Amino acid sequence: DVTVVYQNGLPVISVRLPSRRERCQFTLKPISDSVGVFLRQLQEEDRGIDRVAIYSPDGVRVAASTGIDLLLLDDFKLVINDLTYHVRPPKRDLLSHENAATLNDVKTLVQQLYTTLCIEQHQLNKER
Amino acid sequence: DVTVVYQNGLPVISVRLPSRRERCQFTLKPISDSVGVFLRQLQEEDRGIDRVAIYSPDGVRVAASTGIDLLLLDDFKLVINDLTYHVRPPKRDLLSHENAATLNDVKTLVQQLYTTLCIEQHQLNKER
Amino acid sequence: VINDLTYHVRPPKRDLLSHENAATLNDVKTLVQQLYTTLCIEQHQLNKER
Amino acid sequence: DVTVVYQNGLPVISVRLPSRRERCQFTLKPISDSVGVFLRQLQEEDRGIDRVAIYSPDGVRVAASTGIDLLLLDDFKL
Amino acid sequence: KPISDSVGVFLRQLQEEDRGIDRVAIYSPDGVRVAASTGIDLLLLDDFKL
Amino acid sequence: VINDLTYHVRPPKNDVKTLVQQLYTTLCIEQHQLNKER
Numbered sequence: 001d002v003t004v005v006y007q008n009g010l011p012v013i014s015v016r017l018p019s020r021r022e023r024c025q026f027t028l029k030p031i032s033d034s035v036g037v038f039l040r041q042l043q044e045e046d047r048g049i050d051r052v053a054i055y056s057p058d059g060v061r062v063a064a065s066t067g068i069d070l071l072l073l074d075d076f077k078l079v080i081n082d083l084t085y086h087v088r089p090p091k092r093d094l095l096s097h098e099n100a101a102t103l104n105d106v107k108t109l110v111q112q113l114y115t116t117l118c119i120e121q122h123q124l125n126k127e128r
Numbered sequence: 129d130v131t132v133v134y135q136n137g138l139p140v141i142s143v144r145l146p147s148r149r150e151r152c153q154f155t156l157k158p159i160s161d162s163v164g165v166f167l168r169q170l171q172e173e174d175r176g177i178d179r180v181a182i183y184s185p186d187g188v189r190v191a192a193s194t195g196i197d198l199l200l201l202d203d204f205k206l207v208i209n210d211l212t213y214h215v216r217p218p219k220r221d222l223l224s225h226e227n228a229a230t231l232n233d234v235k236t237l238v239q240q241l242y243t244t245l246c247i248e249q250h251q252l253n254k255e256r
Numbered sequence: 257v258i259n260d261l262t263y264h265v266r267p268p269k270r271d272l273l274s275h276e277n278a279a280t281l282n283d284v285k286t287l288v289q290q291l292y293t294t295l296c297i298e299q300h301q302l303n304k305e306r
Numbered sequence: 307d308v309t310v311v312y313q314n315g316l317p318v319i320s321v322r323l324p325s326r327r328e329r330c331q332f333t334l335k336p337i338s339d340s341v342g343v344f345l346r347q348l349q350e351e352d353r354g355i356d357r358v359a360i361y362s363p364d365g366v367r368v369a370a371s372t373g374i375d376l377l378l379l380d381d382f383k384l
Numbered sequence: 385k386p387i388s389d390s391v392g393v394f395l396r397q398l399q400e401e402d403r404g405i406d407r408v409a410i411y412s413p414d415g416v417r418v419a420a421s422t423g424i425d426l427l428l429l430d431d432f433k434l
Numbered sequence: 435v436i437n438d439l440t441y442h443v444r445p446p447k448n449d450v451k452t453l454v455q456q457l458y459t460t461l462c463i464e465q466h467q468l469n470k471e472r
Contacts, residue, residue, distance in 0.1 A: 008278075009285030031246070031289060050357055060142060061152040065169050069293040070136070070155060094294065099234045106241070106287060107461045109280050114458050117277065122451050137296040147324045147354035159302055176325030176354020209326065232300075239297045240460045241288045248453065273450065281450070284457070314429055320416060330417045333426040347421045350392075 002078055002085040011072060011090070018081055019048045028068060035071055036064035042080075053079045057086070130206055130215040139200060139217070146209060147176035156196050163199060164192030181207040185214065308384060317378060325354035334374060341377060342370025360384055391427055392420025410434055 004013045013026045024045060028038055039052050054062045055077040062071060075088045096102050133140045139156045152173060156166065163182060170180055183189045183205055190199070203216035223231070257263075292298075311318050319332045330351060334344055345358045360368045361383040368377060391410055399405045410418050411433040418427065435441070 006282060006286055009282055009289075031292070056153065059151065061150050063152050063154045063169065063173050066155040067293070069289065070138075073136075073293070094290070099230065102287075102291060103234065103237065106284060109284050110454070110458055110461060113277060113280050113284070113454055117451055117454065119451055119455055119458075122448075123455065136294065137299065147356075157299065159299065159306055174354055175356075176352065178326065235295065235297050235300050237460070237464065238288065238291050238295075239301060241457070242292045242297070244456050244460050245285060245288060245453075281454070316426070328417050330419050331412060332419045333422050335426075347419065350421050351419055 002087045004072070004087065004090050015042075015078075016085075017046045017049075018083075019046050030068035030072065033068045034064065035062065035066055035068060038068065039064065048081075050081050051079070052081070055079060055084075130213045132200075132215060132217040134218065134220060139196070143170065143206075143208075145174045145176075146211075147174050158197050158200065159195065161196055162192070163190065163194045163196065166196070167192075178209050179207075180209075183207075310378070317374070321348070321384075323352050323355070325352045336374040336378070339374050340370065341368055341372045341374070344374070345370070358384075386425040386428075387423060389424045390420070391418060391422050391424065394424065395420070 002013070002015050004011050006012070007027070010027050011030060013028065014023055015026065016023050026038070026041065028041075035054055039054075042052055043049050054071070056062050057075060057077060062076065072090045073092060075086070075090065077084055077086045079085075094102075129142075129144065131142045133142070135155075139158065140153050141156065142151055142153045144151055154166070154169060154173075167180055167182070171177060181189070185203055185205055190204075200217055203214060205212060205214040207213075308319065308321050311320070313333075316333060317336065319334070320329050321332065322329045332344065332347065334347075341360055345360070348358060349355055360377065362368060363381060363383075368382070395408050395410070399408050410427065412418060413431055413433055418432065
């Protein structure tokens with residue numbers, strides 16, 4: 001299969017390469033990678049890949065100029081030399097379409113991480 | 129059948145290509161992107177395009193270094209090898225009377241949160 | 257993997273970071289990026305210079 | 307449809323191309339040319355062509371050093 | 385040259401000098417376009433449209 | 435090491451807690467400037 005899971009703030013995508021029947025993972029930096037660089041990286045990793053492409057689920061191809069972060073919002077399909085793989089677990093969570101509660105969900109986590117690490121003691125330690 | 133859709137605040141053009149007869153979609157940037165490399169992207173996506181042009185519905189031609197902001201207010205005619213399409217884009221509404229003071233505040237706070245996180249790579253990457 | 261070998265390497269671990277903190281920091285680092293993509297702050301940032 | 311005509315003692319292949327919709331003909335010499343020369347020539351004709359394969363009546367592929375007279379004995383898939 | 389020259393590269397030398405290169409082509413007399421990379425001896429053995 | 439001999443040469447001779455502090459101080463100064471102003 002082809003799947004995507006978040007490791008350490010970055011989406012690691014696991015993919016099944018055609019040659020050697022073995023899987024490879026890809027850690028791609030989404031805010032500055034485009035979907036052309038990712039296909040160049042797949043063809044770098046396994047030169048026997050002839051055709052590789054990304055299909056939006058209307059049958060329409062997504063061109064090689066968009067961002068990764070746009071491409072991981074809603075699902076898509078990935079076509080290697082003749083096989084397809086529809087991929088759905090990017091786990092889009094934005095059912096809110098809001099501003100205030102979505103930003104309160106940031107500092108709900110930030111203050112919880114701010115308590116348990118003795119950070120005010122760390123600031124006073126550096127000042128001392 | 130060229131169509132322009134606004135997805136997440138960005139224009140997406142759905143062009144039909146002559147080689148693989150598939151609908152493909154390009155995600156444009158309004159300000160930073162221009163026609164002069166939009167045509168380069170349409171050259172990159174299909175090698176089979178011999179010559180491609182695009183111009184205004186009254187004038188003869190529009191040249192390179194023309195912004196998508198200036199083209200996208202008007203309709204325009206598109207020319208692939210033996211095909212001439214013409215497309216109006218839809219017109220975006222406005223919400224910048226009341227909700228702008230909340231929307232721009234959310235944008236400023238999330239951009240501060242982005243540049244808080246992205247900076248530790250960039251400081252070392254600039255130092256070396 | 258050198259040609260017909262399998263060198264199994266165990267590097268000395270020096271992280272020392274607790275696991276409960278890591279998922280919360282991961283959720284922050286993903287949600288900030290996802291909201292940065294959600295409403296195109298790169299384009300609004302580029303608008304002010306214009 | 308793609309057909310082969312023996313004109314003047316030589317096979318001539320008429321192919322409709324994907325990029326520009328014409329029907330171009332290819333004249334090739336069975337004493338020198340090979341499969342890998344004919345598909346390289348068809349690749350040089352266009353640019354929108356990206357994958358090419360001469361198969362068999364069976365599912366197997368014909369390589370890029372087979373002579374043309376060893377190809378034109380039977381029907382084939384392009 | 386009869387045998388070592390190609391149609392699609394003789395037309396390059398024909399088109400690099402002049403100015404009217406809206407269309408330069410060689411067709412079969414039934415409207416079929418000949419390939420560019422075919423030879424000259426294969427072409428001049430029969431008739432053609434220039 | 436050149437062909438035979440030896441030249442021994444002697445020449446003239448927390449990273450997450452700071453990031454979460456920089457991340458916390460973005461959510462705070464937006465209120466703190468209006469606090470300090472009035």
